[PDB]
Design an enzyme around this catalytic site. Structure first.
Site, PDB file in Angstrom:
ATOM      1  N   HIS A 145       2.488   8.621  -8.667  1.00 43.44           N
ATOM      2  CA  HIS A 145       1.009   7.518  -9.051  1.00 43.44           C
ATOM      3  C   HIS A 145       1.013   8.551  -9.855  1.00 43.44           C
ATOM      4  CE1 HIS A 145      -0.011   7.010  -5.159  1.00 43.44           C
ATOM      5  NE2 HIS A 145      -0.493   5.549  -5.013  1.00 43.44           N
ATOM      6  N   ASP A 163      -0.553  11.811  -9.267  1.00 34.17           N
ATOM      7  CA  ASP A 163      -0.322  13.181  -8.754  1.00 34.17           C
ATOM      8  C   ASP A 163       0.233  14.115  -9.566  1.00 34.17           C
ATOM      9  OD1 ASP A 163      -0.645  11.110  -6.222  1.00 34.17           O
ATOM     10  OD2 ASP A 163       0.937  10.604  -6.527  1.00 34.17           O
ATOM     11  N   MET A 211      11.558   4.843  -8.054  1.00 35.84           N
ATOM     12  CA  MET A 211      10.049   3.623  -8.448  1.00 35.84           C
ATOM     13  C   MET A 211       8.619   4.931  -9.432  1.00 35.84           C
ATOM     14  SD  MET A 211       7.398   3.607  -6.649  1.00 35.84           S
ATOM     15  CE  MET A 211       7.088   4.048  -4.624  1.00 35.84           C
ATOM     16  N   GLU A 239       2.689  -4.801  -4.051  1.00 35.62           N
ATOM     17  CA  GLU A 239       2.087  -4.251  -2.793  1.00 35.62           C
ATOM     18  C   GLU A 239       0.732  -4.579  -1.951  1.00 35.62           C
ATOM     19  OE1 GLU A 239       2.702   0.418  -2.438  1.00 35.62           O
ATOM     20  OE2 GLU A 239       1.861  -0.127  -0.385  1.00 35.62           O
ATOM     21  N   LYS A 242      -1.906  -5.886   0.991  1.00 35.31           N
ATOM     22  CA  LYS A 242      -2.980  -4.581   2.597  1.00 35.31           C
ATOM     23  C   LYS A 242      -4.058  -5.309   2.335  1.00 35.31           C
ATOM     24  CE  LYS A 242      -4.381  -0.499   3.326  1.00 35.31           C
ATOM     25  NZ  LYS A 242      -5.024   1.288   2.890  1.00 35.31           N
ATOM     26  N   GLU A 257       4.549  -3.144   3.391  1.00 33.43           N
ATOM     27  CA  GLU A 257       4.908  -1.750   3.719  1.00 33.43           C
ATOM     28  C   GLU A 257       4.309  -1.804   5.510  1.00 33.43           C
ATOM     29  OE1 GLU A 257       2.188   1.792   2.418  1.00 33.43           O
ATOM     30  OE2 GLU A 257       1.271   1.989   3.973  1.00 33.43           O
ATOM     31  N   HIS A 266       0.782  -2.263   6.657  1.00 33.90           N
ATOM     32  CA  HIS A 266      -0.007  -3.008   6.151  1.00 33.90           C
ATOM     33  C   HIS A 266      -0.238  -4.181   6.689  1.00 33.90           C
ATOM     34  CE1 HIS A 266      -0.236  -1.130   2.221  1.00 33.90           C
ATOM     35  NE2 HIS A 266      -0.254   0.037   2.771  1.00 33.90           N
ATOM     36  N   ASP A 276       8.019  -0.134   2.229  1.00 34.57           N
ATOM     37  CA  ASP A 276       7.185   1.162   2.070  1.00 34.57           C
ATOM     38  C   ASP A 276       7.389   1.313   3.737  1.00 34.57           C
ATOM     39  OD1 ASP A 276       6.875   1.981  -0.289  1.00 34.57           O
ATOM     40  OD2 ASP A 276       4.517   1.066   0.144  1.00 34.57           O
ATOM     41  N   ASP A 279      -6.315   2.232   8.331  1.00 37.38           N
ATOM     42  CA  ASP A 279      -4.391   3.056   7.858  1.00 37.38           C
ATOM     43  C   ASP A 279      -3.745   3.965   8.221  1.00 37.38           C
ATOM     44  OD1 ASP A 279      -1.861   2.656   6.548  1.00 37.38           O
ATOM     45  OD2 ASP A 279      -3.154   2.385   4.772  1.00 37.38           O
ATOM     46  N   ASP A 287      -0.740   5.689   8.666  1.00 38.48           N
ATOM     47  CA  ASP A 287       0.302   6.170   8.039  1.00 38.48           C
ATOM     48  C   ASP A 287       1.486   7.266   8.698  1.00 38.48           C
ATOM     49  OD1 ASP A 287      -0.131   4.766   5.249  1.00 38.48           O
ATOM     50  OD2 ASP A 287      -1.014   6.100   4.669  1.00 38.48           O
ATOM     51  N   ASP A 341       6.229   5.873   2.878  1.00 39.97           N
ATOM     52  CA  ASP A 341       5.388   5.838   2.861  1.00 39.97           C
ATOM     53  C   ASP A 341       4.037   6.460   3.611  1.00 39.97           C
ATOM     54  OD1 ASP A 341       2.488   5.765   1.293  1.00 39.97           O
ATOM     55  OD2 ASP A 341       2.700   4.218   0.182  1.00 39.97           O
TER      56      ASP A 341
HETATM   57  O1  XYL Z   1      -2.270   2.698   0.939  1.00 38.48           O
HETATM   58  C1  XYL Z   1      -2.366   2.707   0.577  1.00 38.48           C
HETATM   59  C2  XYL Z   1      -0.799   2.600  -0.257  1.00 38.48           C
HETATM   60  O2  XYL Z   1       0.130   2.436   0.147  1.00 38.48           O
HETATM   61  C3  XYL Z   1       0.069   3.107  -1.291  1.00 38.48           C
HETATM   62  O3  XYL Z   1      -0.266   4.507  -0.947  1.00 38.48           O
HETATM   63  C4  XYL Z   1       0.727   2.935  -2.334  1.00 38.48           C
HETATM   64  O4  XYL Z   1       1.688   2.396  -1.845  1.00 38.48           O
HETATM   65  C5  XYL Z   1       0.757   3.817  -3.860  1.00 38.48           C
HETATM   66  O5  XYL Z   1      -0.320   3.137  -4.691  1.00 38.48           O
HETATM   67 MG    MG Z   2       2.724   1.821   0.644  1.00 41.79          MG
HETATM   68 MG    MG Z   3      -1.106   3.041   3.849  1.00 38.33          MG
END
Ligand code: XYL
Ligand code: MG
Ligand code: MG
Ligand code: XYL
Ligand code: XYL
Ligand code: XYL
Ligand code: MG
Ligand code: MG
Ligand code: MG
Ligand code: MG
Ligand code: MG
Ligand code: MG
Lengths: 392, 392, 392, 392
Positions: free
Chosen positions: A52, A55, A86, A179, A181, A215, A218, A243, A253, A255, A290
């Site tokens: 990002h 980042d 990306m 993306e 969510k 993702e 998500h 992702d 979430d 991850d 991710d």
């Molecule tokens: O839920 C957070 C998102 O997955 C981020 O990581 C995006 O992919 C990037 O902004």
């Molecule tokens: Mg993501």
């Molecule tokens: Mg996430």
């Protein structure tokens, strides 16, 4: 198994660099140096890195600082051979984006969000990035009367149309990946699923430049089948990026490392991406992780977790290949008629009139008799899990 | 408040007629007579009745029987002044459909499924129906290796293109509404949310003829915001019909009376549908109730439950109107900048070149200062709830 | 691998016997003869069979009929050597139980429910059953005001105290296992999770005779960790029986083969049950499969699915064993300090006074240095999955 | 309406003091001064304030500072007339607690955690607090193999026994309330529901000193019926305290204003707590709001949200009383046989011997006739809702 540059494993700088400051506690890890991240990732087998804007360059750095940072990062890429497939923009952290970037009710915020992205597009183009991922984390609401959804989709569209215009005019050749969510951090986020995101893209000025970046976690937050969602995205040809991570259903979430959540779905997913038509993968882009190294870990645990993602992906690939290659699977597939779905329902040149004249399709059809034949799906499923388990 | 034909409340024959045989128990009510259904619905204020082919004509009735039934039915319609705004086909009950109608792995079931629908299209055309609802309840799978999703979408598309051809050649003027559902009876159903269904419809040969029939409970089974998905459907102009009912999050499909599940969302939905653009409703189709009288109720309970659907809607409508006419609400709306979202982010004739030249959109923008101003969203929400409770 | 009687795999007559009539469709299979079910189960390695009163003797069978069925059943048992480790009563199918059995608002229904159970206890006791499972599937409500929970728990308790009394007085030596479920078929069911059931049992007149019969998919319907809830049940010494199956989070009750839902949780469950303390299993009752062969299957798919449950359990057991015998896993466990949890926090004979006096517990504790050490949990999780995948 | 001290509305310092730093963004509000907090809450009608040690005294404060802070705080309470009904300890923020407090794999942390609580008990006893709330937010795991649940429950018990010993010996007179939560921040937290927490408490040395502190949002995160769980909590007599807030099913913990999530369940909850037997409330403790002012709001939004909590509770109360007082409701309750549930199933003096002798309870019972009569639950639900909408 060992990763190769052809595997196309990429990681976000914000993944291995997550300091583990969650909603209930302080960071448990120190900040990671972008240049060091480049070297460690190169080392575990990644082919690329993403980030990002904020980042890599601290929100508010002067140009002198911003420039120095970019120069150093560029060197590291150079020395290591990693590419930047990306780039993305942070439109969620700063307090100004508390109601969104592109869809904030405040007009000044929307103008600002666009400028922030145009700038990131420049950097992206300079580093050779091909995809711009847009995660609208703050586009949405906690209360229904607070956000006019229609107006919001209009503003979301207005903003994206300008971005494509700019890229095209500057000759950047970027592809845009929205993306989806469903929630977190807003009560509800706009374009909550891969489906909503695809429908939306179909309404832009140059829809051919737009797709999605779905993702794992998500879609799982909505209890949806990730593999089936990807399959639909592939049917539409809108799978521009992906992702990968792990999640345990509807909850915050998580991850987790890819495959550490719904393992059975992780398996059918690798099968879908890799055992494409005519041997070749059905998907050619980056296999981007991710995820976040758990808060209970230190830097050792961080590098371990980075490699676990690669490991998971290659162990599953290996089993998906063997599943498909197994003549017993091949026979169970035939018995279940999986491939019979590929034959058109209609005969060549047949329309409604020929169909209405076919008594075997209705008048003389023995529904009771066909209704009693089994499909043998449990057996085929058991064959798949045995391959996953390494028992066949 | 009392119901008028202008309110356009309709009910499926299968709602009040549900005998309450569930997944774990026998039926608690005897069969409802269609003519009786028509007379009773006319009485409570319904303007229309809908049915699946098999709800009116028992699966497998000879033509004399079938004909006899249709004639009685038309007579009841005639006497009461009730119309048939929509019809649908049962492609889920008979064992032959255990793996789907249009996307069954078995080619012969697929051919039979189309013939069953064509036949129902003719009867709908005959009764004056304007919409054909298609609920692909058996399209999906329990196991990922059992269904090739891509081929399934191809076959789903193949079947729909044919249906549109036929309607268009015969001059039926039907509109087609795909009904999304995430799961149940299949582990996972194809086209699981309103989004997936809209994205799909955009790929047919005559898209202008296709839209969706979203159901409150179906979107809630995935924990999605029903009002927010309806807003997006309206934005795409694909809201062809709507199925209203109640649900309590992700669990089996409850089919409660509209407003008996998520009441806050039921309130925002009525506000959205009725407090449209002019002053006029944003949606002009039937307000269809696809619900089930709880298994604990006898026929007095069934008729009470039908009435409750209409009362919930009118009661919510009245409070939605009052909410919007309140000066205190207008004030809260102004403070939260709801209407500001409707003003374009860009000034007329402004493009990326003009935005980049605007220093105030970035270089001189004080994000810190703007990020500190609150939106007053809780207060607005509180006023909305107080209107719902008749507290103001 | 092959199952042995020592594995104690049991199946309910209603699992392999499910005709596959779901909430949206007709049965796809014909009825299975109980005697034939006994022979087939014996043949795949089951050590026992279980049943609801109504599964074996059709509801309302005269005494001659009943006596006849029972005698033939006993012969089959004799001939095959299968046992009946547990029996249960159907208090959910007949319309009379629409508002529950023991907790129906109607008093006469509550008296009848108790008599139906006493009768089943007699038959269980005659067949040598040691456990009476109680699944209160209709005890609950769709609406909050329709059911007085406090009154319901009193009535629940009143019925259970009587059953224990009867048993004790007849010398039946039965143990009672309450089976929790959060919802379905009622909107909300009383005693929704293994925790609620355990807390309730503790209030009976003779708690020592009562425990729980937790089901994999029931806890997963609430998105709870099944293995962790079994761990707490074992801590309380209330795991009297267990129902094994598969589920995909919060949705209708799927009843898939054990391991076909959440595979990672199935793995950790087999690990907990078999790698109990002192080499031996932590649990010794039957490994009962309460699942349903998918509706797409015929009788071949039915037996395939019955064998899949056992196969799944034995494959995970093999991997759980290898997992623990791995010196690398052992090293990872020592690094993660799993076993250190088993050492009391307080030193022998140390109380609050001594603790208050230990400056190393607070005054001189370096929170910050301890806080920086990683636990190595991700690496330990990676090794577990590599064992599960047969990669190690 | 207007709140009185008799309503017992309390708030934690961390509620209105939440700076709005979530998992994805920075704080949007400045720090709230505790003295100011006391003053503002006294103004809106709270009768008490609560806090975590670390909310008041910054972690790592020297004795002088700590003492300095307490003395100022006591003066504010003095001045305003607010009390401290409950105190709690922060065992979740500092990195040392990453794996838990009381059940950390690390023994040194477990010892430190107990010391930190002992110290808060002292401050609590000193401020006149009655209840010690225990929220084990870090007690749990992300991976099954990383935490021995049984050992964890032993250590949890071991720590609680000691705290009770200490309080009794120092004559503090505290009650301990365990607060369950299913997940967040750990993947899975120990004692996930109200049920699991009650069952646990029953295993302590002085169980009469332990109860639970259930939170609306926590039970809803698992899709459980909050009202029903509180009804079970009251049946057991373990409702030592209650945390009120709003949530929209299974997702991240939202912490909305009470009644801003599941409105229907918020209604039934207020009815249960207030329309207790003998006219009087079934619950007499603090009505505590553990919520968070949305991130989109400023300090004005914060006070608005604090008041919204009280208004929601009093508007609901007012409608629950009207509901119970309505004759039509009384009539509906009678037809639904709600009160018949309170009459014992058995006649005084009847045992299994007399029940077995009653042919009318089985042999001559007409299940079919009883099964045909409806319970009128829908009509009863409809009346409850019209009362909530102020429509009657
Ligand atoms: O839920 C957070 C998102 O997955 C981020 O990581 C995006 O992919 C990037 O902004
Ligand atoms: Mg993501
Ligand atoms: Mg996430
Ligand atoms: O979930 C059931 C579905 O809603 C059907 O009632 C359709 O709307 C018509 O087949
Ligand atoms: O959800 C179904 C229940 O689990 C039953 O199978 C019980 O185990 C026994 O009546
Ligand atoms: O979800 C977090 C918890 O609810 C806390 O607010 C406690 O009640 C106090 O530690
Ligand atoms: Mg519907
Ligand atoms: Mg439905
Ligand atoms: Mg079940
Ligand atoms: Mg069971
Ligand atoms: Mg709380
Ligand atoms: Mg909370």
């Amino acid at each position: 198994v060992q990763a190769t540059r052809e595997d196309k494993f990429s990681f976000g700088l914000w993944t291995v660099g997550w300091q583990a400051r969650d909603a209930f506690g302080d960071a448990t890890r120190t900040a990671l140096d972008p240049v060091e991240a480049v070297h460690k990732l190169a080392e575990i087998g990644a082919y690329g890195i993403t980030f990002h804007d904020d980042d890599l360059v601290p929100f508010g750095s002067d140009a002198q600082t911003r420039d120095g940072i970019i120069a150093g990062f560029k060197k590291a890429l150079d020395e290591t051979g990693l590419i930047v497939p990306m780039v993305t923009t942070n439109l969620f952290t700063h307090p100004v984006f508390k109601d969104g970037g592109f869809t904030s009710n405040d007009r000044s915020v929307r103008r600002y969000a666009i400028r922030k992205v145009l700038r990131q597009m420049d950097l992206g183009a300079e580093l050779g990035a091909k995809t711009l991922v847009l995660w609208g984390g703050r586009e949405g609401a906690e209360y229904d009367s607070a956000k006019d959804v229609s107006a919001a989709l209009d503003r979301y569209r207005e903003a994206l149309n300008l971005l494509a215009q700019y890229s095209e005019d500057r000759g950047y050749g970027l592809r845009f990946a929205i993306e989806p969510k469903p929630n977190e951090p807003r009560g509800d986020i706009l374009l909550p699923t891969a489906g909503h995101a695809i429908a939306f893209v179909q309404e832009l000025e140059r829809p051919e430049l737009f797709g999605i970046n779905p993702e794992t976690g998500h879609e799982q937050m909505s209890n949806l089948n990730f593999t089936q969602g990807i399959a639909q995205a592939l049917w539409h040809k809108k799978l521009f990026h992906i992702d990968l991570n792990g999640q345990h259903g509807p909850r915050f979430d998580q991850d987790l490392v890819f495959g550490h959540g719904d393992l059975l779905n992780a398996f059918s997913l690798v099968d879908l991406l890799e055992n494409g038509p005519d041997g070749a993968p059905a998907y050619d882009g980056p296999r981007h992780f991710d995820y976040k190294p758990s808060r209970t870990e230190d830097y050792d645990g961080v590098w371990e977790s980075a490699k676990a993602n690669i490991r998971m992906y290659l162990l599953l690939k290996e089993r998906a290949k063997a599943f498909r290659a197994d003549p017993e699977v091949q026979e169970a597939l035939a018995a279940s008629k999986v491939a019979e779905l590929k034959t058109p329902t209609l005969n060549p040149g047949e329309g409604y009139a020929e169909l209405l004249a076919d008594r075997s399709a209705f008048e003389d059809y023995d529904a009771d008799a066909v209704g009693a034949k089994g499909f043998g799906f449990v057996k085929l499923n058991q064959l798949a899990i045995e391959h996953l388990l390494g028992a066949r």
